[PDB]
Design a binder for these strands. Structure first.
Ligand SMILES: Nc1nc2c(ncn2[C@H]2C[C@H](O)[C@@H](COP(=O)(O)OP(=O)(O)OP(=O)(O)O)O2)c(=O)[nH]1
Ligand SMILES: [Ca+2]
Ligand SMILES: [Ca+2]
Length: 326
DNA sequence: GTCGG
DNA sequence: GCTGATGCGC
DNA sequence: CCGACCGCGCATCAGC
């Protein structure tokens, strides 16, 4: 991290814009700049050097110059002092509490961990579980635990039906030595883009993982997406493992390559890749890549036989998962 | 906040 | 109930 | 200058 100081600064600014200003495009602008700088292989010496990078403009160059000279940003020092901004930024750290909800809470006088803990009845289900595991959810997961988690999930899914394929994606598939949480892509031959020849495909798998006490809470659950909480088994006399967030996504078997591209990320990589797709006259989602027509209407799904084919369509050289960590 | 048409 | 918008999250 | 900014699942709420 040659430029940690700068990218931390921009990340803080992005978070401010999302959580407090509720300015989602300013948030993405800061994130995009943060990401381009993070992969820049030189220690940056000026805002002018930075402004050469795409996504870094005048305003960010000016901030980078201030940060380099002093080591601080006045705009940020002030944000850190504002109690309302600080409270909103804190509350949004709870899963299920976003910028709108946080601001509502701050109005009602709820703005600390203690406040939340005595007002659970003011929280929806998701929020209540986010509060319950507030501390655990901020811890990262060593790849070594991610591997044990993978073994449990893969083996339990095999027991429900040997035809399931479960692939762990997210940062784990990108080779990270630690992950924020577990993301599992699931497929079954009974569920394709053409037919759903079997109901409860996701349910049954969630049920089995609850049965062995791996999954411990549900945040949300539909026919194709589960978001919840899980925990590794611990040994005799040892402290329990932290509770972890787990997402499970059931994707049509014939659309696996688009799905695994999506779920492997990173998020910024996906946003960048999809944006580029639009520039090349395609739209990409987790299911398909489709041509855009003159009218601007998504056409029919193009044939895809590998992750690489998606890269081919938009004239990108293939990038292995480990190089998609933007 | 940045950028391409 | 459904539909569409909005909030939140991936 | 200025329109456009990735794309979508689930939970919630208003309006009908
Ligand atoms: N298109 C798109 N895909 C996203 C977005 N956010 C997340 N994804 C996809 C790509 C991510 O790698 C994948 C899993 O999301 P996560 O929040 O778990 O992130 P990731 O595993 O990369 O990082 P982590 O180590 O868990 O903090 O979901 C998004 O905003 N847009
Ligand atoms: Ca993850
Ligand atoms: Ca996740």
């Amino acid at each position: 991290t040659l430029n940690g100081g700068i990218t931390d600064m921009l990340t803080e600014l992005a978070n401010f814009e999302k959580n407090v200003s509720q300015a989602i495009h300013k948030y993405n602008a800061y994130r995009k700049a943060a990401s381009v700088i993070a992969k820049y292989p030189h220690k940056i010496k000026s805002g002018a050097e930075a402004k050469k990078l795409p996504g870094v403009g005048t305003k960010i160059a000016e901030k980078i110059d201030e940060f380099l000279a002093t080591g601080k940003l006045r705009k940020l020092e002030k944000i850190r002092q504002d109690d309302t901004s600080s409270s909103i930024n804190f509350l949004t750290r709870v899963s299920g509490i976003g910028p709108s909800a946080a601001r509502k809470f701050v109005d009602e006088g709820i703005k600390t961990l203690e406040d939340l803990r005595k007002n659970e009845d003011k929280l929806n289900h998701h929020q209540r579980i986010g509060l319950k595991y507030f501390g655990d959810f901020e811890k990262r997961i060593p790849r070594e635990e991610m591997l044990q988690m993978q073994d449990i999930v893969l083996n339990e899914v095999k027991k429900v039906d040997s035809e399931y394929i479960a692939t762990v994606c997210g940062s784990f598939r990108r080779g990270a030595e630690s992950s924020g949480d577990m993301d599992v892509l699931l497929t079954h031959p009974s569920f394709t883009s053409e037919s759903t020849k079997q109901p409860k495909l996701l349910h049954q798998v969630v049920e089995q993982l609850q049965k062995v006490h791996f999954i411990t809470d549900t945040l949300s659950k539909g026919e194709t997406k589960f978001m919840g909480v899980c925990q590794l088994p611990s040994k005799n006399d040892e402290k329990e493992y932290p509770h972890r967030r787990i997402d499970i996504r059931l994707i049509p078997k014939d659309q696996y390559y688009c799905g695994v591209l999506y779920f492997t990320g990173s998020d910024i990589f996906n946003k960048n890749m999809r944006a580029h797709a639009l520039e090349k006259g395609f739209t990409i989602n987790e299911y398909t890549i489709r041509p855009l027509g003159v009218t601007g209407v998504a056409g029919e799904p193009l044939p895809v036989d590998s992750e690489k084919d998606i890269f081919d369509y938009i004239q990108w050289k293939y990038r292995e998962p480990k190089d998609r960590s933007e």
